[model samples]
Target chain A: VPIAIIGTGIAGLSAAQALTSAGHQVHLFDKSRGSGGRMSSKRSLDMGAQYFTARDRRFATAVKQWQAQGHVSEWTPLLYNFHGGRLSPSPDEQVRWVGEPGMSAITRAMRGDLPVSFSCRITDVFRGEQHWNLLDAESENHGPFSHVIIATPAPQATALLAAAPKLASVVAGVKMDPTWAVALAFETPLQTPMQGCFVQDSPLDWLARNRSKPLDSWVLHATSQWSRQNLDASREQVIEHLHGAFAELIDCAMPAPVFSLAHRWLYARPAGSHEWGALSDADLGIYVCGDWCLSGRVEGAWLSGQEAARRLLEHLQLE
Target chain B: VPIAIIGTGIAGLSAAQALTSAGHQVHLFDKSRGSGGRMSSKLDMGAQYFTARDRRFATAVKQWQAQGHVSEWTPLLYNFHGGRLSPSPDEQVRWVGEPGMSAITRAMRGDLPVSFSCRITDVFRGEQHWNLLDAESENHGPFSHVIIATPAPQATALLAAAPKLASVVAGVKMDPTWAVALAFETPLQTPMQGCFVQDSPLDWLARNRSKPGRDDTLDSWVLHATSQWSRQNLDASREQVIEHLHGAFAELIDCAMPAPVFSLAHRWLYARPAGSHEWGALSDADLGIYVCGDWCLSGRVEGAWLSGQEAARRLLEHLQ
Candidate 1:
């Protein structure tokens, strides 16, 4: 029987790849049209997660494979810290990587012909006598699988595991943050030397030149506090305030953008840490994993899925 | 009681980094201003990329990957034979150092005091320690141990006093090749990312732009001539080699040759190993001398690194 994997983010795709490679069938599910979750692209810009860094040996090996596949490229952007129109070069520089075409390329490439049901959101999951069954949003049910792994955000994963108190309480402790993103494209490239700016003491928390990754665009992300305050604001209203902040950080009258757009993310990032890297119960054949279970980065999500898959494989072997 | 390492190639650097991390003070020597020996980025190209297959190397590669100094190249590349292009997918893809092929070597060269431009001409047994004499007639050594990690031919010369090891390395042979780098202001819209030319004068042609971790400002291509052809034209002028390779490149692309904005040809005397595989580090504990290089194993970047690292580990064990 095919193991059911909910969520097609890096965490979900990673687990699916490991399971399939180990000669097990996997059915992956995602609510979005495409995979990559927070690493997704919007309007030719990386609106979710911008870039990623690999620190662990396991993740590093996987990243090496990804690079060989041409799914990602090194990004050494000139980064700066902005404080009320003053620009200062960041003292610490990180070796970061972004998707070749866009940030979503990594996760989407990881999917690699696996069985995936895009835009099929699962509302609830029930543990049966010998297997698990999934309840979809359209009053449809799928699976009698021997195992189930939930790789969605904390809130959604918690809701799906309501009947499993142990796992629910472990996930409930994970907090999330919101963010408002504004995308802008000008007639020509910006004259600024900085490719990315970390804004301090303002509504804007981050600003990046999307062109730094082979595109002609810019993306500004609001601070968590500011995004929370105007979480329900209209896209146009959010754009107005964020765009003004962007111009102020550059200390110049920004060129009129040829294109402009905005998006609001309710769970943009994990606000705090989770004690466990992944949660699993072999008796129930249930597992939960995501970036929220660790740090909110691409590597975190990938490792989470990897850990869940390893645990699941171990349990399957013992049985 | 410091150890002196000669040649700062991948092997030398690998050894230096390991010994330094193990609480040993190492003084490294290289003939050039920078590290990376053959892996150096000359003009535009040298060793295009390297593959990892050995288990030990895979573990070491994991460490380099975490350091953010290396990345992977494609597994599927185009193969050209008798004027026909076809896909040839390799079971294992290659992992390359970023910025250039030399990047990984430079990264492995941790903050050790390396005496660049200091060429060692001889190594002899002093009263108690091995002493080194540089080409400039400068004597700088008296080290507890010395490891020669240069190319095979060079290593044999430095190991002349150690006749047993010298005779062992004397049986090893190396082949040479010439590479031409062509830089174009505009892209050459070829469908293939990289190609392996078979039964032709050219052995390999790669679009440098396709490789990641490089500045995308320029469209560059590297063409390598077959070892046989390079050996035949060993004394030919650089301009002659560039013209011949450019003509072959134009023929392969099926278009009129566009004048390259920049072109240069580099000659490599020891590009390939010729059959003898006296694998692993050559150590003489009594003499306190060790020798290693790609010739000690298979001829590849990973081979060089493995040889150097193994040599360092054995020497450290002896000291402890």
Candidate 2:
């Protein structure tokens, strides 16, 4: 029986890498056509996870590896802050890392040569004697694995954990918030040195110049409050609203974008951080993890996914 | 020679405890007359009760309970909607500070050196040290490190010297709360210990005595207005709030109620964080300045404690 991992996002890939390195045969499943769940890209922009910081020594080591592999690079964008009708250069020295081309690049690189079945939305899991099996949305069944890990969003993980009622109940309490990101490409460059801004007192939270990341566009992430209030909104409406926010926040914005794109991440990030490093049941041979499992950061997701793999391997009995 | 922690709230005391346990001399500072910043029980005006979810926070709460500084509060929760009242089915385990919510900080304060009424208005990083300046233009702290454990807005102002840290925190917006505490001449006849209201100016209300370790004879109740409503009435007179909230409370409560024998209205300008972020406690290890509060994670009590733990961890990382 092989080990099965769901959702080839950072968390899932992390689990796969850990298990594979430990000499275990593992298979990865994802709902999207490609990897990187929310970290996916749109219009040359990382529509979800903009940038990540490496704090823990373990995550730092992985970042070092990624940099050596040429998939990750240091992002030294000219950061600015917008507050009280004032836009000033943000005096920041934090070391922020991003994918070389886009945030999806990191995930795509992590998924290297791994066995992943894309476009496979696993709906539920079932127990087959001593092994576990996964069922996808196409009414197709994947065979029994000695262990299974659900690394999807909290709500999605809850649905798949029906086979393990106890694990399902604990993860049920974890909730995630939404974020509406818009990518716009202007015909001419904006007259501002600010490549990224941490905005306040506006409908926006983060406004970044995508051109800094080797794109000819800009990105606008609406505040979480604004995103939730407009949860039932259309993409056109979201793009229009975000356009207005960008125009208002940008110091010298005067022209409409030649191109625009809107993406609504319903489970953008966990509502709050929890100390539950990762949820696992040794007896059931089931584990759950995601950004929602820990601090809800890219680092946390990676850490949690590896932790889940560690727990599963520790519980494996010698046959 | 010693570490300096600004603000004697749960976050400050938490950081203090860790540094002290690690054999470091730490001094705590507070602008308030006593301990607990937003958790200050101005007769339970700041925080009424908080539920613990994180295992580390739950463990800390358990110890506080054993030390008689915290207690479990199982309120007979209720909900009000359509001008009707019904029992709320929320069985979330909540805990309150024993005697008052401020006691939780006092217990965490244990044996730590704290300077009450010492407002640290400025923080300038000195060569190889940090100095804290107060309102009187007097300076303190030629210390090793400085941990600012205040609300995001207040902390932003204090970190002016470290504008990099300030800009990282400026995006964190905190909402306000208009807490109206009423002391009735006699105990109310209602069986409702707490309530969650909808379609009303008030968001929550609870009888203070219903909590564990509260005064038995004193009949006090605290009411919190909706954050939006609080903002709308941010500058209204204390009497106006009492009249309006008392009106809301009366209409919601079926039983007849007499005017409060004593009433106090306090406004928490930075009551809770408006939106959540993944900062998990901010740090400019280069500046030797760390920041933490409930705003760093969840705006709950547990979040404050956990954020404090993280700030200390980051600071110690730099120190080592």
Candidate 3:
């Protein structure tokens, strides 16, 4: 492979899409057995990324392409706010785009025709005689590629950049927050008008009728404080607490869900924003990018990846 | 007074305004020395500015503008992401409480019967009316109707006589916020009139002196941490909080700044309702009681005023 990108999340997969389209041979590696990182979905649920908004011009263009290709669609949900034991419609008009079948669909669509080696955690990245090299957690060496782009979370990205101290330190400063998501499937859909709700007065932060995506499904996201306080809690405990919160927010009759699942994303999102679209050192042909490097949105991830590829291509001109 | 409204915040004041305008006599009671709950930034550390969006709130804002209680505020803001700073991308029409957010409540409180520093801790129904008791064992009310315009948690306690209403109010959660104010003898040269920060412990910081009707003698800045961060350090010493937040602010601002000459920290236990809701107000006509606050609505300045209006409207209907 002419280029090696670690992680196949939106950031890395996005870079691969751009690099391969530009006539460069690219190889992708992800620790998860699949391509999607936070954007992936499990059966009957989307445990990671729920929906996204494209604010960047480049990412917005890509969204239009993805939409036309049947990988993405607008989710104009009937949103409501559940506060003070009352439910009322929320006045929000921002267009929300979600994956067609699942959030992972976008990443799967982006990885078309690209080579990705699953279950590979690139633990080490170092400069070889003429190019960069990557060694996985399994102690398997696969590299000597002309360039390397790191698109993982900040902490993991920091660990891989040991040979590049400057880049490592810069990525280390970025802080990412954890998120606990619980997806519940009911035998019969709850009779609630709100397709999505912003909750308060409880540990739960948000709730959505996953049926708006057309299933008798629901997903609840806990507040950062609540999630932080319960980081060590078992999944069963989280599901029970959030389920009770869900029950409190609605006016409908309560019924036990047929299925319930919980997922904890330790690096679900960057705590803040930074102006660095991407970080790179032309001399070493190494680049770094993710949502943390920019606005901390899915659009930020895609744009940062695009910028990383542009910087990588700029360096490749010399070769 | 035929009616007693507890907690002279925006909600209570709004309810009072409607009742007074409709030729009904109403009195307000508060635990604080003055009226302005979260909006009262008497010491330069409360709500910086608010927006008028709802039709009812927009009308009220216009009337207040003419009364000199409110004024239009447009701040040239900035954004500090990662370690870089740039002009903020969002620009919206904001309204301030003239000299401070408390100005709106103070103006509305004019000539109204208000019992300041009388903390009413209990409300009990007796016969056809209700009586309230304060922390000092002072007694108030035997009034026809009462409007509880306090935060949800406080309202929950006062409305204990009305269990149904209390339980409903209990569902709304309010988050805590730690606000730190720092005033430097020498002006800090930064374009940070107001900046939305990310990654850092500080969520927002503003050059207080840049706002209209502020003391320009000293360069003042107010910083607020995220609720998650504040709850984590809920019991932190004011000195400890000031040092930690100031250092965090200093790291983000490259501009030179001297040690603050005056510093203060305030922990707002009920800063605002978490998440959001659209309930304009809640009322129990049978109990001749009503509830209104940002918690019962959108959790915005507009919501507080609108909820108050709705509370008064329902109360008036019950009187008929």
Query: Looking at candidate 3, what is the lDDT of residue A260?
Result: 90
Ranking by lDDT: 2, 3, 1
Those runs of model 2 whose alpha carbons end farther than 4 Å from true positions after fitting are A1-319
TM-score of chain A of each: 0.96, 0.97, 0.97
Interface RMSD of each: 34.9, 22.4, 23.6
RMSD of each predicted structure: 29.3, 20.9, 21.3
For model 2, residues B1-320, the per-residue Cα lDDT tens digits are: 89999988888888888888888899989877888888873378888888888899888888988998888889899999999999987768888888899898877887788787776755655346777767554678678899999887567546654545665665566777898988887788989999999999899998988987778776888999998888677656689999899889988996878778899998776788888876788888887889999899998888899989999988887888
DockQ of each: 0.00, 0.01, 0.01
CAPRI grade, predicted model 1:
incorrect
DockQ for candidate 3, C-alpha atoms: 0.01
lDDT of 1 at B169: 58
lDDT of 3: 0.81
Q: What's candidate 3's i-RMS value?
A: 23.6
lDDT of 1 by residue, B28-89 (tens): 99877788888873233678888888888998888888988888877348888888878877
**What are the models' TM-scores?**
0.49, 0.51, 0.50
Report residue A287 deviation for candidate 2 (angstroms). Answer: 54
Residues A1-319 of candidate 1 have per-residue lDDT tens digits of: 7799999999999899888888899999887778888888864679899888999889989988888999888887889999766888785656888888888888888998998888887765664345677766564678877789999877557546633546655565465677888998888777778888889999999988887774257899999889877765668988889988877778445787888899877678788766467898777788999998788888888999998998999898677
